[PDB]
Design a protein around this ligand. Structure first.
Ligand SMILES: Nc1ncnc2c1ncn2[C@@H]1O[C@H](COP(=O)(O)OP(=O)(O)O)[C@@H](O)[C@H]1O
Ligand SMILES: Nc1ncnc2c1ncn2[C@@H]1O[C@H](COP(=O)(O)OP(=O)(O)O)[C@@H](O)[C@H]1O
Ligand SMILES: [Mg+2]
Ligand SMILES: [Mg+2]
Ligand SMILES: [Zn+2]
Ligand SMILES: [Zn+2]
Lengths: 531, 530
């Protein structure tokens, strides 16, 4: 990555117009880190890649230069919902912008096509899907005439990581976006993304023929965020009651976000929150722009205090004063959890990120990510984070952001750093040999045990056909047995087995690959517990 | 992975395998690596087979399906490709079916029941990778079928699509690792035409195959005679030269003509039919009933020549194709090899004639603007057309990184058979001259198509440049065309594309290597005919 320090100045020829536009058009007071530096590189006509967390303020880095320049900026966006999010903001500020996609009606294409070459056009930003570049002969011809006419001046590729083959959400049409620099060399190009994945980045600039460009990365550590992991109650109504108790206790009247795993979860939490005295509203990426406005305005006006969102690509909820982000269920990955929880405290003031860890959520999420080649490994990293009690949470998260995370100290801004608790290693080897007996007897019977069935047999319940004769139940609460099995799953003494049923993927437990170590009587399985 | 140890017929299934080979598929012998690949699958191991298109990869999983219990699941990327297989299997009396996005509900219900029907005749089920990633119901039936020991084999056609290190990465191929993870006792076979060891090692990880045998076929087709001819300027004279060539050399024999565009194929077909050659056009998107008609008329010689257009999905496979004529050059050496490789599948001598046209360089270059390496891939083909001093197999082997020699070709290509005398010509003065016209075009602010700047070179075209004694070099047009093409490959000149309302257009400009002409000692040479 390049050093931005030299660009963190307001002594450029355009600096006066930039500060004008920032305050009197966008109605913002100061730049966030790396905004001015990225803008200055683009404004100087140079190529730049910006790596900044979701919610960090990337859009401004190309929207503002468009408003300070002649003509328009072409923005490459992967989703129509993402373009509508941007057009909603730009429309509210009184900025002329538009979009083109495959489903665009003919009368609108004819309009945009003509406005691109119209020297008296108000259009400053034109958002198009990569298909408009690869699979539209007509649009390219207008771009060529716009470019020759000095009206097409800048290129912005949002979600530039889609270019590379080794990154999230690869779009095939992004590969062809290298044509832009080859055909329009005097147009500066900016790449925006929240991953860092340096291979993905160095590769994206090669696909874009923008090799080596300035590459700026923001510091991903958010020192004002307090990270916490809580036990998720087994009872759904006890869980929603604990959430309402937590909101009124700590965050009385403050705006917050609740992330749910599923679309059903998000909707049912909202009505439960409403009954329990918390004004809440759901937000989804598939929503109509007028529905998104409905939520955004009620959230800003404190009509609804909590926005219950469901984890999906297209989340356009950004408020500067989000005081708490609660994860109703854990994320699919550590990278996802950082970005989702990172929507808190964008006003640089203290904000809490509360994660509710549930044993059942391990298998519900594992089953949903079965088709992702590394879905299980990525989820078990999240579960391992929930299980950790002896490491700073900021250190655990930073492990996934190695190139973009300052070593900067946590300063008691996570629960593990704050709690003055001692730990102790317990022997759980005999419990593992018990679980393997139950599972082997189910194999002899051709019975697949879910965690529910496996725990039930362990306790002396469930089908007596799945119980083992001499196996005394452990005399431990059901959630200690859950903790033990979760430990055996991460350490791969147990392993998941997926079963595809007509309507859903289901998780079963099976003898894991490390269970053979228990043939040597000297092998001891321990567990760190709170003392 | 040594195929020798597998090249034997002393397995328990060996009798059944020959039975099926001769009495169902009705082939007499195996082609190289077929028996070895079949033997590896039949013994329950994972195998990757790298074999050119048309080599006979499909049989390596279709035949084992007939000798095994239950059905074999085939992962295919295109609907047209699975229909190509389903047409053959129906002809041979083999029960096979397919599932796709457009599949009707009654056909899905039928397939779903046959998969769990212990007495079902379905031997092969062809599905798209979305049926694995995005169908709960199908995976549910696959699991039932697998537990009932009815789902025993997996075939992944175009297995290179798994790995993203390659340009044909199909996103849904990423999820195909679920198959080995969920169905470990089912052996998996990967079929591909792309050899690159880099992409194949990654695909073996994506598919979660630990012990994978890899068999690779050689590129060389020893019975194929490779030749490059000039493409005549007039379309009607060209089609006349083609008909003369068929009636002269290939009287009454089956052949293929490859065309660049959709209307080229249609225009060639009618010109052949009027000129006395029974011909038929073929496309990859065609109906399975139209493809059936073409193959049947071709076998019965109702149609002699099949005019095809270069595309992904061509199932024209006839063993006795005596000639393949390229009406226009292919877009790449990889395409030209596979397209010409459809000739002489009966191991008898077959001719591969490529017609090289200067204007075709830019027709193809403009059409491949969206391929990141479309231009580089085409210039290799143009370089092959330009070569006069090397064995064609040396140029082809160069494409696969193989080396070769004329002794290995043994008088089986035009450059090996027709020995012409040549000389290195100093064309640097021609290059400095060509740059002058292009610099003057910059001064007048308009740029040039390929047609223009031969005309200025010769003193034509609205008096573009007439200074510093640029008389025509006293060389024919076809020689001036070859000179510029050499200067395009060696990037003293470069292409400029312009996007117009209806098509992409190519212009020329001073290429990046023109700086070396500041050193007067720099000499640009080119071999020309004596
Ligand atoms: N300099 C700034 N000052 C205040 N708010 C900002 C600034 N830059 C961006 N924002 C706000 O941050 C929110 C999210 O920004 P966005 O463009 O979505 O970033 P990203 O594209 O990284 O998610 C927006 O609502 C925007 O108004
Ligand atoms: N051993 C063989 N002998 C004769 N013909 C064969 C043999 N194996 C395959 N073929 C024929 O070759 C043609 C093309 O085979 P195909 O399965 O399309 O190979 P690929 O999948 O590699 O393109 C088919 O029409 C088939 O009948
Ligand atoms: Mg963004
Ligand atoms: Mg095939
Ligand atoms: Zn900490
Ligand atoms: Zn030769």
């Amino acid at each position: 990555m390049s050093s931005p320090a030299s660009w963190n100045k307001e002594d450029f020829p355009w600096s006066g117009k930039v500060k004008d536009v920032l305050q009197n058009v966008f109605k913002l007071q100061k730049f966030r880190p790396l905004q001015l530096e990225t803008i200055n590189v683009t404004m100087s006509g140079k190529e730049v890649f910006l790596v900044m967390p979701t919610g960090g303020g990337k859009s401004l880095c190309y929207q503002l230069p468009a408003l300070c320049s002649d003509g328009f900026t072409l923005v490459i966006c992967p989703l129509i919902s993402l373009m509508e999010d941007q057009l909603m903001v730009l429309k509210q500020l009184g900025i002329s912008a538009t979009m083109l996609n495959a489903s665009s009606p003919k009368e609108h294409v004819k309009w945009v096509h003509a406005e691109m070459v119209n020297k008296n056009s108000k259009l400053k930003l034109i958002y198009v899907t990569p298909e408009k570049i690869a699979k539209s002969k007509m649009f390219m011809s207008r771009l060529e005439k716009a470019y020759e006419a000095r009206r097409f001046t800048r290129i912005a590729v949002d979600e530039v990581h889609c270019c590379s083959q080794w990154g999230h959400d690869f779009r095939p049409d992004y590969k062809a976006l290298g044509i832009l620099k080859r055909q329009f060399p005097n147009a500066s190009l900016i790449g925006l993304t929240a991953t860092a994945t340096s291979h993905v980045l160095k590769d994206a600039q090669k696909i874009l023929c923008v090799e080596k460009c300035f590459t700026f990365t923001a510091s991903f550590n958010r020192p004002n965020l307090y990270y916490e992991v809580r036990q998720k109650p087994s009872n759904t109504e006890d869980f929603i009651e604990d959430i309402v108790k937590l909101i009124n206790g700590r965050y009385k009247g403050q705006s917050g976000i609740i992330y749910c795993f599923s679309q059903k979860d998000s909707e049912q939490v909202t009505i439960s929150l409403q009954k329990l005295g918390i004004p809440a509203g759901a937000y989804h990426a598939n929503m109509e722009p007028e529905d998104k406005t409905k939520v955004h305005r009620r959230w800003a006006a404190n009509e609804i205090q909590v926005v219950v969102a469901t984890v999906a690509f297209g989340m356009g909820i950004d408020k500067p004063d989000v005081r708490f982000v609660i994860h109703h269920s854990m994320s699919k990955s550590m990278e996802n959890y950082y970005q989702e929880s990172g929507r808190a405290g964008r006003d640089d003031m203290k904000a809490d990120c509360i994660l509710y860890y549930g044993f059942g959520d391990i298998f519900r999420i594992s089953s949903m990510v079965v088709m992702e080649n590394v879905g299980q490994q990525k989820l078990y990293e999240m579960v391992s984070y929930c299980q950790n009690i002896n490491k700073c949470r900021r250190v655990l998260i930073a492990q996934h952001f190695d190139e973009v995370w300052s070593p900067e100290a946590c300063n008691k801004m996570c629960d593990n750093c704050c709690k003055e608790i001692s730990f102790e290693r317990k022997n759980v080897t005999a419990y593992c040999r018990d679980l393997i007996k139950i599972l082997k007897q189910a194999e002899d019977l051709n019975e697949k045990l879910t965690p529910l069935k496996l725990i039930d047999s362990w306790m002396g319940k469930g089908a007596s056909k799945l119980r083992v004769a001499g196996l005394a139940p452990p005399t431990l609460p059901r959630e200690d047995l859950e903790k033990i099995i979760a430990h055996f799953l991460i350490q791969q003494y147990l392993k998941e087995d997926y079963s595809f049923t007509a309507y859903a993927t289901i998780s079963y437990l099976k003898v894991g690959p490390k269970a053979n170590l228990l043939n040597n009587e000297a092998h001891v399985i321990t567990m760190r517990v709170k003392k």
